[PDB]
Amino acid sequence: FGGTDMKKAIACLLFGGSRKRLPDGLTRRGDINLLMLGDPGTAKSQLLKFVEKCSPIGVYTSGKGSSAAGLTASVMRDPSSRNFIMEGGAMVLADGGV
Amino acid sequence: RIQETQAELPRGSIPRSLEVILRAEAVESAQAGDKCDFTGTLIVVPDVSKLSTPGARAETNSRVSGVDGYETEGIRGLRALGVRDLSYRLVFLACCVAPTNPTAESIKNQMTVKEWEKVFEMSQDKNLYHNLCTSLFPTIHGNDEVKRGVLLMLFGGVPKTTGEGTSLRGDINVCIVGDPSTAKSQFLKHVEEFSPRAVYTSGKASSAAGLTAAVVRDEESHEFVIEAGALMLADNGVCCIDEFDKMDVRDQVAIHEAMEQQTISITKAGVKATLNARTSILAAANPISGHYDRSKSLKQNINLSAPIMSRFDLFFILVDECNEVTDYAIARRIVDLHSRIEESIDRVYSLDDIRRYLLFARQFKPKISKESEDFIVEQYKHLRQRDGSGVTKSSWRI
Amino acid sequence: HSVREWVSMAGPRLEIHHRFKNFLRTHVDSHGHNVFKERISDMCKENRESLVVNYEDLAAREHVLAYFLPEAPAELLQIFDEAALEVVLAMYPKYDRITNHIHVRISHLPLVEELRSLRQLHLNQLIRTSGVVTSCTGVLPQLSMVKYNCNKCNFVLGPFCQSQNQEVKPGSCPECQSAGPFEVNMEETIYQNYQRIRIQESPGKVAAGRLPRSKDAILLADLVDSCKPGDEIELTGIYHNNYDGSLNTANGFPVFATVILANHVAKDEDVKMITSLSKDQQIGEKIFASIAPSIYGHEDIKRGLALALFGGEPKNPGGKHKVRGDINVLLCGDPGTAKSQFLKYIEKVSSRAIFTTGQGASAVGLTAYVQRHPVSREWTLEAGALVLADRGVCLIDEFDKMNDQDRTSIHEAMEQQSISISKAGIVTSLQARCTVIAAANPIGGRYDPSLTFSENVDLTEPIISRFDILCVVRDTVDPVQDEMLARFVVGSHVRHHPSYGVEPLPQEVLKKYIIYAKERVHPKLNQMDQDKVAKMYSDLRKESMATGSIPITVRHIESMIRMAEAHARIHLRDYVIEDDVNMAIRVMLESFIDTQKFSVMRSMRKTFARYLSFRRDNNELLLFILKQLVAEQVTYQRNRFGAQQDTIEVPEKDLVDKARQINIHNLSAFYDSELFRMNKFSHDLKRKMILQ
Amino acid sequence: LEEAAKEVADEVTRPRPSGEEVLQDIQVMLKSDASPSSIRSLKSDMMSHLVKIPGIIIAASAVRAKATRISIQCRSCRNTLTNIAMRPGLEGYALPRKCNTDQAGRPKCPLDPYFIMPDKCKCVDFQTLKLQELPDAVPHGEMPRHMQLYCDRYLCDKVVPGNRVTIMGIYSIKKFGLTTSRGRDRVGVGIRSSYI
Amino acid sequence: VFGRWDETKGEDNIDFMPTILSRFDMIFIVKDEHNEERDVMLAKHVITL
Ligand SMILES: Nc1ncnc2c1ncn2[C@@H]1O[C@H](COP(=O)(O)OP(=O)(O)OP(=O)(O)O)[C@@H](O)[C@H]1O
Ligand SMILES: Nc1ncnc2c1ncn2[C@@H]1O[C@H](COP(=O)(O)OP(=O)(O)O)[C@@H](O)[C@H]1O
């Protein structure tokens, strides 16, 4: 119930903007970032879950990551066989998603 | 495997370890943690990887030489002459194993008529409550409450099980907290000396694998064998822990697990096993500031976790008086020890008699009488009512 | 000569075969019925492959076979198998198409010594042991009747029987006379079921001062997967040496390894009864009182756990709005209130319940990880306790002691109902549809009535908000309650030495009712009353804002609905009525009010006495008033006198006035009530007084 | 069926561009609507038959090379045996020991004269996978069971670890000769490692 | 920051530094607003759902 403006903001979030590289090699962000501050019980988490389901690519996480997955990527070296391993984080696992 | 005892150690030397082999009927005896005398032979057994350098070796007396195309080179020549490396090790074979110093009906039958006479004489004395306090602790002055508590912990209670699958503790655990030099480690040392199966450990000296258990592979067969820790060697005995605060929090977690479940679970090296640890714990701890603060509760004076704090049956607190006449009474005893090396002791019962009586006494499983039910109910009611607001705060809460 | 030597020769072999055939054909029970008749008939009805024989009957009928059985098991078992196969094929001719062999297993025996006593004397004999299973290798295809392909030509060598002692090595190809090599014809070979088990002594039977010992056993054919790890079993088997590789040769003494080969293992109207119990008008109170027989008091907690166990119903219109039906429970209590016993009972009752502790060293972890298992030595993905309890209950003890990872995983599993894993090249999402029940202690070690629930507990507000029901167990010195609790404890201790609700249902009946209600009861909300709910919600929010702390939110209403559904599931109602709604209202209001501090709680309790009094007892309220007055008098006596007096007395006028304030004008039934006598109260008309 | 498919493909696409006359092999995959069965139901009776099983993939090894046609050479006379067909699955091959050439008057070749020529062999892709029982169907209080899977040619890289897959295959055993048991444990007799 | 919004305090209700807040495009603030007749509609909508 309610939040028509909020729903429209979420829709334009889902569609997203357009990214633009430049001749100098510099880039400019083409994606939208939103913040929602509110009292408990204001139906915020449900919108996030609906966005996660609606978008073709979507990851839902909290602060400090998830149960067994971090929020950012990390790099290690295998001592037995020398290979540079990288662990996918919640941000790396999404490309073009929400 | 056997080890050389401490009394035989020379200056600055680690105890010697030896391997003993049991055949047929003698196989049964000599369990882990014992202190036993062996009688047998000393025998030489070959070894493989002793010689990284060439040494004494065997050969054949035949005067045989090679022929062209079959010349006695290294490998073929060594194999043709049957050369074997003479390496050896020392192994003890045992034919008699005995205790160094030696089911209630079985215990009664084992004892002789004179031993049973002594046991019966001990049995019907009220001074048994008093004299046992003085016998085990002749030199320590005062602190009779701690002596009584330690004796009660030694005798222990009765374990029971319920119909729902739960189990109830039958052991008693004791903690002592006190100011410096209040004979706090003397009780631990005396209990270690008296008890036949007791292990004394300091907080930081013992590791996690030192307690609990370890798993290693059998030398010959495919099976596995278990190395017992301090708690397993002290099974159905007393474990003494000095400087209880110095133990790691995770070691304290393991100790609490052993105190609650009374079971050690091992899942390592392809072996899953459960072992029984029915130990009674005697622990000594220091105040946080090095002295007991009279203005604060017990929970604010010790750095111990709440669960293990609640698991302990009894806490004893020792505080040193400054200039009371006891300073004289203490001194008179101490010099009495130095002036009289062995003649200043008036023990009533020898330690062996006490051990025999304790072994006989631990077999009993007394029940709870009907009047005792109501008496305990009313006494617990009074104890809880003591917690009322009409009187000052107490260290505990009931 | 040895027993096996006499067994080997053909004469006594055929004679014993005939004797066993006659024993099979002529054996009858104590009532004259042919035992093997019914046995083989019921075996035939399910196309089974095994037959069970008792040593007692075998010894009674034919003594020589029983005498020879222990000291020559393999050949005698083979002969008995042949005889049984002949008899069965005589009874039915179709098994030549179905099963070409039948095994004979010995069921009962004179009990043989434990694992300690097995020594050289028991080699190649028949023994019976008891132990505890610790590991299993799974099911493995072993060879039997092997066909080999020659590698020079392509001839197929005939079937060879695979003995358990040595591998089969064919001599030469019958046609080209080659000496090898040969390989196994995979398509034409026959295979058998094989499993390996490790058995350890029961820890209760081990004498003090020594350690439990273990031994290995092998199960074949129908015996596979008949035991779970951690169970207690009894085997009848053969103590064996003659298998290749038993002798230690490379180094050390000439030591042999022993193995045991086992051949036996020894560990409609209900729906009508459920409907009949549902027909009873007071089934709900029976179920409420049926929970936790061994715990005294805490009736409200048991009532809440009833709804938690029965549960609700998830709802998801389309694939957009998911709403769970699992009712989580949180308990916060002072030490000694027996919070863990509730979790133990719930684990015992629940069909699928997982238990874990946050302090550390738990048997089951709370976080998924990929690891080589220490026992099976296999690369496994071990999910947490949350994943394992799909459509089940997860229990967490010592909720405050949990570290960062456990809190994060619990928050993710409670709010999203799924667990995400990104470890060792594995990216997964797993379902965590489970009900969470937790127990905890306050921050200072004692609950403070002057502070809110959040200030008393180490947990955070987002975690608390997830739980539908919060229960607070505060320890307070009540002499009568303490006396009753002590009486129960001492009675339990004495009983277990080695030498309101009319009647609770049996535990198995309760389990069956729970299963049936979960499977076949789906209450419908087609008769809800929105007007009363909306008005009550508005009034609750209004007075919450008037007090000025912790306002109510829509989430609570959802919980109410779920609880209502749970209540409708208790009575097997297919539709929701006002009684369930009012009960859920009472539960939700109690939970909400109990989390407030002193003044706010008192004001809310006084104002909302209308709703909280649904199906309540006036006598209980009067008892509460009397207890409050008694406590006030006792506190005054203790503060002024410095000690309690021998008697407690209270005028009736104060009780009457307070009852009038709660709109109660008669108290004779309260005087005659059982609650009055249980607390040892008396009423004297000679002085118009109440004495305790 | 693969030979029939190759012949049909030759029939339909005869006028190919010049130079590429070589007709290559064709892999035939299977698919069905039959409902699956539990992995726990796999027992001795299902050997060398066709089974359908669900699972979750937890490990996938690297793609390697396996030979299907080999050619070997003799030490002395340098004669060659060509176009020897290898068997599919985890099965090996044993080289012959005798040189099969008629030589009268000439001296003869020694014993075991054959060497494998690597540059004259046909190779295909090879992969092994590890499959675990579904958590949705694992019995309460029981450790999950595992299985090893063999992937050949075009089936490689179709599955990423973490996916939930349904697999149709043949239940088999490895065949690397009658090797002796190893290790300090020798209880098991006549056990061949199984796979799908 | 305090668990529930405090309108009169204005600022200091948000703990984030302005640097991280700059990266957001739109910021929404939601409050539990007292409306006696709106609660009836919300309850009816919820029960209807
Ligand atoms: N109402 C009761 N009925 C029966 N036993 C009780 C009751 N209250 C407490 N007990 C007993 O009190 C003892 C306290 O141990 P228990 O593990 O139950 O405590 P807990 O409440 O979980 O405490 P903690 O906060 O330390 O985890 C138990 O042996 C339990 O049987
Ligand atoms: N306007 C609304 N319409 C429908 N449902 C609502 C509305 N407001 C609240 N709810 C219900 O209340 C719950 C709100 O919880 P949640 O969204 O998790 O709160 P928050 O996002 O603040 O943590 C949801 O489950 C939702 O079903």
Ligand SMILES: Nc1ncnc2c1ncn2[C@@H]1O[C@H](COP(=O)(O)OP(=O)(O)O)[C@@H](O)[C@H]1O
């Ligand atoms: N009450 C006492 N009676 C006899 N000797 C005592 C007494 N108190 C202290 N002592 C002596 O003082 C020393 C105390 O040291 P110790 O007990 O090791 O201190 P702590 O255990 O606190 O580290 C002991 O050697 C003991 O001989």
Ligand SMILES: [Mg+2]
């Ligand atoms: Mg000391």
Ligand SMILES: [Mg+2]
């Ligand atoms: Mg507890």
Ligand SMILES: [Zn+2]
């Ligand atoms: Zn051949």
Ligand SMILES: [Zn+2]
């Ligand atoms: Zn050649």
